[PDB]
Ligand binder design. Structure first.
Ligand code: B49
Ligand code: B49
Lengths: 289, 279
């Protein structure tokens, strides 16, 4: 897992707090390469073997659409995860300045996220948290999924020995959990709306009320507010990723052949366009020269 | 309702009932009680105790108070002289159709109440159904039912933004992926257990049973010896054992079923069983 009991300041120069555990911009002391350092506060009763396993899940990822992992540092009951630095931050950080993404910019992001998701799911990993805040953009306009599952089955293993009085739905939860990797496909459909509208659907509704409505029978999956503005391909992409039944929701590899993400002309240049907007968001210079 | 003062001060310890539950006597009133001894978050502990304390119904064991001493938690509960139905049938053998119909009615009254309080028992079985000396039926928690409910309520307060969650993820975040109707199915299995001395598939490996239950085309269990039981009993088993929880009847709905609504269902049927237990 490459977890070093050393102080991270020995190898890296902390530069600036990027966000919030806490993420910092850092420079490699020998090469001068920019990295990101995610600091996670560890409690004393935390199990070491469980931390090594979680870290190794990140370490064993070798895909272009998942942030690269360089190493980890355990010092002062604080874990420092060293990863690929993505200059433009998250898509949430970006759209909060630029406004709504265009249909082609979203199509390219969805394609890149789906490539990341197809790889994770083929390794039996579930991101579990796909949203604008967790999709990073580097200076080249490239898309990376941030780290997942760190400091997040054993309880469910206890009941497994006595299933004889269990209802079929309880037995299904006990054996495979109440969800699988297809939860990420639904989260990506919500993310595509988020990128188009600046908010996920029902964002103005109380957290608890949304949870209740989502579980309530007759629950209708979200849809894009405007119609004509978006192609039939984009509306269908949202409709199929937001399939209510996970038994009917398509896999990431199935989605990769969808018209919205398989169309020609989708490249990081679409994101470099968005980045240009980010660099100069306000109006041009006034008469005061 | 938890105290730091050692329980031996209020109660005289008696014989171990099952392990860890103990029979005990109140030092001032002489009243018999049962003490559940359990060997860490104080927020989750208070949540568990409150679930037990707020259970005030004639078909649910009464809570008296709790004691935290030597890192051990002693939960003082109402005493039921005949122990669990499991303890009983391992001595008497099979219950009759009328004794089962009476137990099912009493359990359903206990469940209708728990379900009305947004509580789920989650471990309905012969082992968790107590019988007192007067032939009355009380639902109990030998295991970790209140712990599960408390742990779920704890996870709810710490549940992050829900807006990107798939509906199935929302269901586990909100209620562990199922609802109160699981108790209805467990009651269906318990009625077979009281009739045959074991739930269906008891002889089959638990991993194999889990795979069998989660497979497509899984047939709900049925009573083995069909001619021994009435059409009403066969039907009660059929409807409580509805595979889909969308079609499974509620505890209030089940209380209007012929098997449990019929006259001549009273504690006298269990008194006959208890005398058989003493014979
Ligand atoms: C809070 C205000 N911020 C201004 C500094 C908003 C803009 N955000 C920023 O600058 C920013 C930048 C430039 N990078 C990141 C984050 C990460 C990065 O590079 N690799 C990672 C790997 C994993 C991970 F989980 C996060 C990151 C942010 C938040
Ligand atoms: C296996 C046969 N054994 C013979 C010695 C045990 C028979 N069983 C017995 O004696 C017995 C008696 C008389 N009460 C209980 C249990 C409880 C009780 O009264 N209130 C509760 C409240 C909560 C709870 F979680 C358990 C009990 C048993 C096991």
């Amino acid at each position: 897992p490459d977890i070093f009991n050393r102080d991270p300041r020995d190898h890296y120069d902390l530069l600036q707090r990027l966000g919030g555990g806490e993420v910092f911009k850092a420079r490699d002391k020998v090469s001068g390469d920019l990295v990101a350092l995610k600091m996670v506060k560890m409690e004393p009763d935390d199990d070491v073997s469980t931390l090594q396993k979680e870290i190794l899940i990140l370490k064993t990822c070798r895909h272009a659409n998942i942030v690269a992992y360089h190493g980890s540092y355990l010092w002062l009951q604080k874990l420092w995860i060293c990863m690929e630095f993505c200059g433009a931050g998250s898509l949430q950080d970006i759209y909060q300045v630029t406004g709504s993404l265009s249909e082609l910019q979203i199509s390219y992001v969805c394609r890149e996220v789906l490539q990341g998701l197809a790889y994770l799911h083929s390794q039996k990993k579930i991101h579990r948290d796909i949203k604008g805040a967790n999709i990073l953009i580097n200076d080249a306009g490239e898309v990376r999924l941030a780290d997942f599952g760190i400091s997040a089955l054993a309880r469910r293993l206890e009941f497994i020995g006595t299933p004889y009085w269990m209802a079929p739905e309880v037995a299904a939860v006990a054996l495979k959990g109440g969800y699988n990797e297809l939860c990420d496909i639904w989260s990506l459909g919500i993310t595509a709306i988020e990128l188009a509208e600046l908010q996920p659907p029902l964002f103005d509704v109380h957290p608890l009320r949304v949870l209740f409505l989502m579980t309530k029978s007759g629950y209708q999956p979200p849809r894009l507010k405007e119609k004509g503005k978006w192609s039939a391909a984009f509306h269908n992409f949202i409709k199929v990723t937001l399939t209510k039944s996970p038994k009917k929701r398509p896999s990431a590899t199935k989605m990769l052949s969808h018209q919205l993400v398989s169309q020609p002309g989708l490249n990081r240049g679409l994101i470099l366009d968005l980045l240009d907007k980010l660099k100069n968001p306000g109006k041009g210079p006034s008469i005061g020269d």
